[PDB]
């Protein structure tokens, strides 16, 4: 047991410590208003159920693009085994709209031990609650 990952029954893996997830998406191979493309490791790629993309304006208001309890998975592994987080996917076929270089473009990750299979006692489906983990956050002009 890595003691780092938070195992469970069947003695599998369903999530590590934040500092562990952060370290994987630590290396970004490419970022654009269409999606990331970092290099995520299979050991982690497993515990994650999806990502959450949001645009935080200079003042302080944050908009979640794929704001949905089930649109959470916008990731997908390729040929060269590189993960491409697809912003454009759940933003109705449109890429990210940044109207000001200083708006940040946060992208969170959700360990499976936090993922919600369905709504709640509020008939709510928002990405609030879902304990997310930031993994990337470059301003607007740092993106390009």
């Amino acid at each position, epitope marked *: 047991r890595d003691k780092r990952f938070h195992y469970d029954r069947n003695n599998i893996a369903v999530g590590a410590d934040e500092s562990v997830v952060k370290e994987a998406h630590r290396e970004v191979i490419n970022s654009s208003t269409e999606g990331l493309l970092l290099n995520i490791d299979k050991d982690i790629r497993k515990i994650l159920s999806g990502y959450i993309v949001e645009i935080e304006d200079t003042e302080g*208001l944050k908009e979640v693009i794929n704001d949905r309890y089930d649109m959470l998975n916008i990731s997908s592994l390729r040929q060269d085994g590189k993960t491409f987080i697809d912003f454009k996917k759940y*933003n109705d*076929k*449109l890429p990210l709209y940044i*109207s000001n270089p200083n708006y940040k473009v946060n992208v969170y990750a959700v360990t499976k031990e936090n993922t919600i299979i369905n709504p709640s006692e509020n008939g709510d489906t*928002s990405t609030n609650g879902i304990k997310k983990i930031l993994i990337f956050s470059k301003k607007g002009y740092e993106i390009g």
Partner: single-chain antibody, 227 residues
Framework: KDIQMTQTTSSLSASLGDRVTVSCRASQDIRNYLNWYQQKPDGTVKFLIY???RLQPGVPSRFSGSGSGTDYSLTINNLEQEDIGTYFCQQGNTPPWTFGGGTKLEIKRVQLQQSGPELVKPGASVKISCKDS????????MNWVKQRPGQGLEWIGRIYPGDGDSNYNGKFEGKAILTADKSSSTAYMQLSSLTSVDSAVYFCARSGLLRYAMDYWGQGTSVTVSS
């Protein structure tokens, strides 16, 4: 149902240099997904603020949106002759999108080219045409909004030229038929079987970059219907 937007103050006048305030008011937490548009005097339509307070580039710093929950409001610090117009506030949380009723502001004392005005005999179809001239046609949606006095604005539907997917409104399920032609950047609506009811204007606002906001609007198309 349709999230019903309410603009209690239907109209107002105010000298220049005044701090005008236009207030919208949703019928259920729309969670910030609200935008404001200004309808100039020249029957045109400008996209101003999206997502409650983010200003569209170009808008003069003296504007500003506010709120959260079900009480959003535009505030025009020290008014200026070129701000006159009728402001609407379309929500954009849970489709179908629905606009307010407009708060006509007075003064107390062409990338999207639409078709020509139609005139039909009660019971005939028509085909209005939105002719985008820009470059982002098959890469940006196309919403068709319907304006008629007293009825703020009703979102009809939209199609995405680039592939063919489309969405409609419940009241217009059986009326409009959105068709588009990727080769000549053009959309077409087809109000089939008209009535004295359809007699209205029909703008064709294209929503590109912002699924819940139409940035460029056509000019309109007076589709009046006789007896």
């Amino acid at each position: 149902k349709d999230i019903q937007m309410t603009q209690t103050t239907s109209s107002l006048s105010a000298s220049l240099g005044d701090r005008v305030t236009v207030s919208c008011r949703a019928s259920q937490d729309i969670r910030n997904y609200l935008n404001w548009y200004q309808q100039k005097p020249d029957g045109t339509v400008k996209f101003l603020i999206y997502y409650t307070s983010r200003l569209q580039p170009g808008v003069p710093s003296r504007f500003s949106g506010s709120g959260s929950g079900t009480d959003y409001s535009l505030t025009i610090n020290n008014l200026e002759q070129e701000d006159i117009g009728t402001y609407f506030c379309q929500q954009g949380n849970t489709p179908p999108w629905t606009f307010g009723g407009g708060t006509k502001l007075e003064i107390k004392r062409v990338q999207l080219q639409q078709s020509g005005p139609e005139l039909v005999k009660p019971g005939a179809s028509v085909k209005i045409s939105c002719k985008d001239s820009g470059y982002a046609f098959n890469s940006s949606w196309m919403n068709w909004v319907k304006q008629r006095p007293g009825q703020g604005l009703e979102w009809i539907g939209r199609i995405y030229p680039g592939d063919g997917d489309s969405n409609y409104n419940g009241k217009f399920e059986g009326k409009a038929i959105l068709t588009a032609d990727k080769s000549s950047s053009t959309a077409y609506m087809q109000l089939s079987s008209l009535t004295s009811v359809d007699s209205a204007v029909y703008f064709c606002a294209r929503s590109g970059l912002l699924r819940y906001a139409m940035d460029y609007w056509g000019q309109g198309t007076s589709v009046t219907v006789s007896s």
